[PDB]
Amino acid sequence: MLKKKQLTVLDLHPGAGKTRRVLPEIVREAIKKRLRTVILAPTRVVAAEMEEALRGLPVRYMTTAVNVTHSGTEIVDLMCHATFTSRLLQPIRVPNYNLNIMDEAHFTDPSSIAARGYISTRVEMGEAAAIFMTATPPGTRDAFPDSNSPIMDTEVEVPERAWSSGFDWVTDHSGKTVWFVPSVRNGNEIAACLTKAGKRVIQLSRKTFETEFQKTKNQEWDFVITTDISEMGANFKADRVIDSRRCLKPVILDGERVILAGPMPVTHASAAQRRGRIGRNPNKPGDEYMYGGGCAETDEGHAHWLEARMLLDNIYLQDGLIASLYRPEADKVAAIEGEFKLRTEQRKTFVELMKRGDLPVWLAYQVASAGITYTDRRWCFDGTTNNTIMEDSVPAEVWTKYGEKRVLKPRWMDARVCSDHAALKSFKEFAAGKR
Ligand SMILES: O=C(CN1CCNCC1)Nc1ccc(F)cc1
Numbered sequence: 001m002l003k004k005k006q007l008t009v010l011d012l013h014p015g016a017g018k019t020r021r022v023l024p025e026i027v028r029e030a031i032k033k034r035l036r037t038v039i040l041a042p043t044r045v046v047a048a049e050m051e052e053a054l055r056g057l058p059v060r061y062m063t064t065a066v067n068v069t070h071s072g073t074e075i076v077d078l079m080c081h082a083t084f085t086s087r088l089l090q091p092i093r094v095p096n097y098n099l100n101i102m103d104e105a106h107f108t109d110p111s112s113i114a115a116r117g118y119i120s121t122r123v124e125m126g127e128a129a130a131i132f133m134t135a136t137p138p139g140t141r142d143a144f145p146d147s148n149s150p151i152m153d154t155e156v157e158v159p160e161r162a163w164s165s166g167f168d169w170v171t172d173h174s175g176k177t178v179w180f181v182p183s184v185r186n187g188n189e190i191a192a193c194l195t196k197a198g199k200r201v202i203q204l205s206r207k208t209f210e211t212e213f214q215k216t217k218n219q220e221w222d223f224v225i226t227t228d229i230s231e232m233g234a235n236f237k238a239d240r241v242i243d244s245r246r247c248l249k250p251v252i253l254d255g256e257r258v259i260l261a262g263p264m265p266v267t268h269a270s271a272a273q274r275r276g277r278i279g280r281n282p283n284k285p286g287d288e289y290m291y292g293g294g295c296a297e298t299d300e301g302h303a304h305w306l307e308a309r310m311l312l313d314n315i316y317l318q319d320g321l322i323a324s325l326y327r328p329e330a331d332k333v334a335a336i337e338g339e340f341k342l343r344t345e346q347r348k349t350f351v352e353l354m355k356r357g358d359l360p361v362w363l364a365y366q367v368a369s370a371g372i373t374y375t376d377r378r379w380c381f382d383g384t385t386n387n388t389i390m391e392d393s394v395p396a397e398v399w400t401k402y403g404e405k406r407v408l409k410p411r412w413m414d415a416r417v418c419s420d421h422a423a424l425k426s427f428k429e430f431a432a433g434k435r
Pocket of ligand 1 (some may be wrong): 060061062063064069083
């Protein structure tokens with residue numbers, strides 16, 4: 001696999017041992033051949049599990065998830081997918097790695113799609129080798145892959161709201177369940193219903209993931225309520241998965257606003273990874289997977305693939321050349337390579353709006369391409385009245401950096417800035433000039 005000019009997809013089934021058994025053997029062989037190598041983890045939780053699997057090997061951990069200081073003897077670097085893309089965008093030199101390994105290579109966040117595009121382009125150029133590790137590669141149509149032990153698959157109506165009757169099987173269970181919901185707000189309602197019924201519930205989402213995931217190891221629980229972030233290598237000691245089979249889809253409308261459409265069906269890859277949380281113990285057959293809908297190609301026209309092109313158009317490759325998306329996912333967006341390439345100062349604003357501003361890629365691009373500088377927040381208040389952000393059914397208000405109370409009405413509306421209480425609180429702080 002390690003031969004230059006080749007991309008290998010390591011598609012062993014979930015729980016086959018890609019991370020704990022295969023990855024250390026690849027790393028040893030890469031060090032034996034003096035290959036400068038990068039290992040890309042989807043999250044800090046996976047970065048910490050990888051350190052345990054690679055312990056003793058000379059790996060430089062470029063993440064605060066692992067308490068290990070580098071010694072300079074390392075030619076293998078390990079970082080998150082988002083950190084790789086961030087360092088490529090920033091004015092810092094990233095080594096031209098001979099071997100590029102991406103774990104949980106199915107991740108559809110924009111920075112992970114961009115990282116696959118950049119790496120696969122370097123392989124196409126004949127400059128590098130790559131290994132993408134995932135049971136569910138782009139375009140997979142199999143929601144029921146192999147597992148370490150047999151799973152009981154059952155199609156059943158799954159609640160998406162609080163209930164008083166008709167779903168006794170949910171609460172009659174005496175084991176541990178991982179339940180995938182389409183949004184944080186939907187999980188809050190289901191969690192409250194379960195807590196009122198006497199269950200112990202932990203909730204996971206992208207913004208709370210490292211902190212709350214530790215609770216699944218440190219205390220007893222009956223349910224974990226989680227969004228799709230748990231499809232990325234999160235391991236639980238569970239015997240049942242309840243899967244709504246639904247997700248939200250960010251969609252750009254008329255090139256001028258982003259809505260969160262749905263909930264709508266998940267892809268086959270997501271359904272296989274959600275199911276893949278159980279059936280992992282060869283000595284415990286009969287884990288249950290209850291699923292509440294079918295699968296569909298909901299990654300087609302999904303904003304993340306247009307946002308990955310915005311990132312790739314702004315990464316230096318070679319002169320004016322621009323990296324393409326990885327071939328099996330290149331048709332998910334109608335976009336021309338290079339259409340989002342920004343001039344020097346606008347590119348710097350675009351990067352800072354994402355890195356420090358914590359804005360979605362699409363929204364950071366609208367601001368930067370309009371020639372607005374990072375600290376100028378006048379655009380948060382001068383949009384049309386239909387762009388008014390609401391807080392508990394009344395227009396949201398903030399004190400601007402000038403000390404005036406104003407209604408939040410952004411020039412460009414991206415539903416991701418106000419999709420839950422935490423997102424809206426963060427956007428109000430941004431509008432106020434607090435970061
Ligand atoms: O960049 C980091 C850590 N950094 C990652 C993402 N942002 C927050 C923390 N460490 C590093 C270690 C060794 C090196 F040689 C270079 C960088």
